């Protein structure tokens with residue numbers, strides 16, 4: 001039926017309705033640090049989230065998204081391997097039922113507890129709808145989460161999860177600063193890829209940060225209390241909403257550091 005992460009409609013079944021699932025530039029991938037090429041020509045990342053305007057948070061049945069006002073250049077990503085300006089439209093996470101899994105990307109086969117995706121779209125295309133149809137329409141900043149100390153900046157997100165427990169629920173989420181979710185360093189790996197959920201469009205330039213952020217066990221626990229199902233339907237805990245690593249094929253992962 002509609003896609004999910006369960007036994008009968010999970011990643012291994014997506015190819016039936018979305019042929020692109022077996023394409024040439026699918027994500028996520030495993031980052032082999034020893035074969036990644038240090039590219040000295042990669043420019044540093046430029047993150048300008050000072051004028052970011054969050055609007056709401058919603059449970060779309062696959063994860064929870066915090067949406068931002070992208071009507072104009074308020075929160076943008078430039079530099080790195082990007083040509084142009086990409087506006088932040090939303091961010092979400094992928095997590096597991098256990099601390100030893102949750103990330104989509106792996107580093108030397110190592111899985112993290114979760115993964116944050118800050119989704120941006122190329123402004124030269126006018127709207128996200130057009131951007132998804134282009135090979136460089138999207139730029140997603142990936143940040144690994146590992147369990148340890150608490151992340152203050154993540155707490156506001158954690159506190160409101162009860163208001164959006166089931167599919168379809170949304171809550172006003174204004175004045176949230178995404179800068180509180182960034183690690184100290186902006187060193188990254190980059191490669192051409194795709195959305196990790198259907199439609200699985202290959203329109204993404206992936207930028208994965210080397211340094212994970214730490215979140216407390218209690219914070220991740222709250223992610224695990226969300227529901228895939230809507231109100232009044234049988235409870236299915238939202239956990240393990242991650243796609244396993246895809247083959248790298250004819251691609252090269254570049255690194256901005258050595």
Ligand SMILES: NS(=O)(=O)c1ccc(C(=O)NCc2ccccc2F)cc1
Nearest residue numbers: 117118119132140194195196197198199
């Ligand atoms: N996990 S991830 O790769 O960062 C990712 C980022 C954005 C989307 C998205 O916008 N989906 C909706 C959507 C997009 C395009 C066409 C139809 C849709 F429903 C999905 C996955």
Ligand SMILES: [Hg+2]
Nearest residue numbers: 132133134203
């Ligand atoms: Hg595309």
Ligand SMILES: [Zn+2]
Nearest residue numbers: 092094117196
């Ligand atoms: Zn994602």
